[PDB]
RNA sequence: GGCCGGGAACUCAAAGGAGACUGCCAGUGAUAAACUGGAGGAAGGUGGGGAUGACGUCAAGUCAUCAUGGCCCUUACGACCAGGGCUACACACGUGCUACAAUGGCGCAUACAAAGAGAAGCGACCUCGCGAGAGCAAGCGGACCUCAUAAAGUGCGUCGUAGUCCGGAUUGGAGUCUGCAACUCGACUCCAUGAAGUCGGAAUCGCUAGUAAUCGUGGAUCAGAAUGCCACGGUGAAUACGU
């Protein structure tokens, strides 16, 4: 019942960050129910190059988006203590929603 | 008997999953005359099973949702092909000799950036 | 219209890129108006210091910014005190504690960002660009660089009108991601103009 | 083609009507705002109306209940 | 046979009988004869004369082919004898609207023939 | 083409029956794409040709267009310095397919009530050879033997 | 309904139970019926918006 | 384009969010569903003394540091080569060329 | 009501990789290169597509994204605010949208997508309005909530080639929503009207397959304002004899 979202943009670097709190959380409460994840989140742009005319140069850009969530499956008072003010992945948006 | 296939006809996916012994076509709780029974390509959910006798011998219960009506239409072909392993001794050779297990890619073709319908150019005389 | 940055192309799948944080549309604006100006700030009083790249990885409610130089000697001044002073006129402008990270190069002289003003450091007095170029490209070569391409812009020579030429050496990939090259530009404005740099210098592969 | 919950009228556009109904014919008056809209309580007014160069005299009918004074003060010359 | 005095259903749906009159169109078309409980799809071979004066009182309530003619040019006449905008924007052969008028304004300018 | 000589991908035939010489004339009788509504149209317009005749659907279509194959027709072939057109001898192979487009332009004219009636009577008299889709095709006959030069 | 029970949006709270007591954060949303408030807590920098009840934080 | 053109903004940022930021009850719920006596009238008659410069219709996104009033974007609220200006030296994050 | 258990089979969801190279077989050909058939496979010859635009030409465009040498204004060409104009009109072209009907206009019954946007905002039910939508109000800073009832299709019919039950411009009347403000100058819904035109001359534009074609929708901008545009999805060809 308790969710653990993980918000960010690559899987390049929150792969690191979903091995970090599934294994932190076993040495101390063992108790959860496995990362499940959630649809890659794609924001794609096409913006006008040319400074002052000719509407043909189109360039594609994307600020790509990917959520994670974790789901530790009872609320433990030793998994939530050893990882309050502790999160390994740096610049990413954690929701510990308990 | 209890066997799996799949098929995915543009953007449709399917669950197939075969049945011996009962005569029925039931398509995702759907019968055989009232939801395709007047449609064009009635024998699509049938079409390679001409050499087989399953009329009278298998019943198959078929549940495709997303993608078109004739891509539902199409992946209930194309996932019987991956569903005819019971007997895919006398199945799998004809299949790719009738070419039936193919995917047949035929794509959404992505929209190019000027091409207008990702192909078609606008209109250019000489001048 | 010609030449696509490679950088752009292959930040991230190669190189990693120059800001990394997450933020909502809603703080898209806040967390971006800080970046701009205080390197802007950055680059008025760290321009002899001889930098690199100012990757800003700004977390939720925090700010690190990675200055990447090699000569702190003169950043830190004496006994560090002038890095609280890049910390002083930055706490208070966007408002959050910002530390800072001057994390340097053991070598100046391999870097796309230290080619380009080099020349443009001793444009302001005339001098035969050729030969200033040719000392950084060679040196740049021997030392292990496998490939470069350098340019130069303006109206080189006390010129009118309009001139460009490259020194080729190496290796330049443009239609090959997979392997290793930079790129940076400086301007050069006086009493005659804007004289300006690229350069194209190639590292290596995976 | 606004509102049925209200029209509008600036309030120099106002009490201009009611200094008309206690002193009358004198001059021509004067405004800017040509999106000021006309009410019944106005009638007979000679208001001349800023069409961005000078001021284009109006007269007011009964009709004019949800009509502005542009269609009466126009801006566009022609020939 | 006789409806509005000389406008004639012409040997056709019911339904089609009443939208050939000037003065009405979609709805009240569809109102007229569902208020004489008559269905749509019949012809004037079954509409008979003793529904056609039920049909006079239902189209006694509002406004009528010559009868319409005359307030809407009555309305613009009006328009003139405000002499406005609205006024001088009619006789000229010029479209009154949020127009792009400069090359497609066909209807008041015509025919390119001059 | 120019180099890279291609044939033509197959037919996709008659979920009726697996005919593979029915199915080019659905696709050319199909316009902008709607297969569904235009097939059915044609198999009521083989409803109107099978109690006309009652004789069969294989044959009784196959005797209109087999009694209609243009043995040739013109086209233009550069051997000089101007426009002249040859007469081609065209393959059985290639008789079929060009005779049908004479036929599904007749269901576009003489529109008689409805396009299931206007391509009826236009495919009842191909069977004849009297019909007026067959009335151009050996106009071009008349063309075609007013210029028989090459052999 | 008082103080750290009538919990507001954007209104700062204070944790005193479970591992994010003695630490402050703001009640971005609140859910009377459910008896819990939406707050999160600046953990590392990242505000960590956990569910804490009325007596599980109190009104700052 | 101009600095008096960003001049504006400053002004306009100013004095909308001293009221219409704020204080919308006076200005959008006080003509809804009630009596058309002329007191609601009299409401939108104290709306006339404010400024009409103060009104979020003046709302012009612009570039912040050039002030670019077409070929906008809220997403960055940035002008149209400034989303390039960071996406060709990753002075945004995610911000990779779309290569599909 | 996959709604409540159960399940880890399975669609889907998302990662690190496995998968293709003319590897193998035969003819031909200079034991080479190499084309193309046979095989299995998810795909067969750069599997479909995108991204990357060499040296350079037009000393092609932009000083109005920004920078910047000279030049001039620097009691003005700089600055401020309240209206108009950019929305002007005999005529011409360009690129788009709509019909010129029956494979159709229309009414009822019923079928099936992927991509993505969302907080001084997007809006489930409920009550009424011919309708459009107003008031009231959950959820939702999001695979859970909403936007969002996707249409052509199909079935029963209904009408029979007429400027027509085709078509939608114009214009008058009455309003819905936005916002200081809808005259000049918004959009939409509805009431009313219903002209041109029944495949368009020389000439010329697109296109090698889910391409063509037709039907439907979302998004960026944004108080409001798309037939534009960037993207998505539905059904589904002809023909490349030859240079």
Redesign the interface.
Known sequence: RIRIRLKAFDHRLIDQATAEIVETAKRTGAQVRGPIPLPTRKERFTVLISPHVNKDARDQYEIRTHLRLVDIVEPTEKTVDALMRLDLAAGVDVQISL | NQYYGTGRRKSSAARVFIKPGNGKIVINQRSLEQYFGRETARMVVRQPLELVDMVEKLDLYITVKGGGISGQAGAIRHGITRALMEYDESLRSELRKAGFVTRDARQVERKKVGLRKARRRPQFSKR | GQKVHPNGIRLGIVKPWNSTWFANTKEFADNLDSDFKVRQYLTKELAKASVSRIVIERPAKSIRVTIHTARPGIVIGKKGEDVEKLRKVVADIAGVPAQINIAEVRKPELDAKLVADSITSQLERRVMFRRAMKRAVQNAMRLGAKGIKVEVSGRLGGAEIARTEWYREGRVPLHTLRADIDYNTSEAHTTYGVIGVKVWIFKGEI | RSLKKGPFIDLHLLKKVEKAVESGDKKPLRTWSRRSTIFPNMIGLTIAVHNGRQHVPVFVTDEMVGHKLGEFAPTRTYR | ARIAGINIPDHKHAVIALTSIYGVGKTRSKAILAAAGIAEDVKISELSEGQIDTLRDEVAKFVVEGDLRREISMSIK?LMD?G????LRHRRGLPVRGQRTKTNARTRKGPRKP | PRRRVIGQRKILPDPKFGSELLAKFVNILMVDGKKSTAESIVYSALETLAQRSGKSELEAFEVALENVRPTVEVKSRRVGGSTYQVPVEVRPVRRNALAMRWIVEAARKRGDKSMALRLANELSDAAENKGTAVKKREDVHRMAEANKAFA | PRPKTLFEPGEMVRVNDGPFADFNGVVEEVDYEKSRLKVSVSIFGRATPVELDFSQVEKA | AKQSMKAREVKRVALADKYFAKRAELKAIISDVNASDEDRWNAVLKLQTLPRDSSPSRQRNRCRQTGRPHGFLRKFGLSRIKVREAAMRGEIPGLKKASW
């Open positions: 009006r405000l406005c905008y609205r006024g």
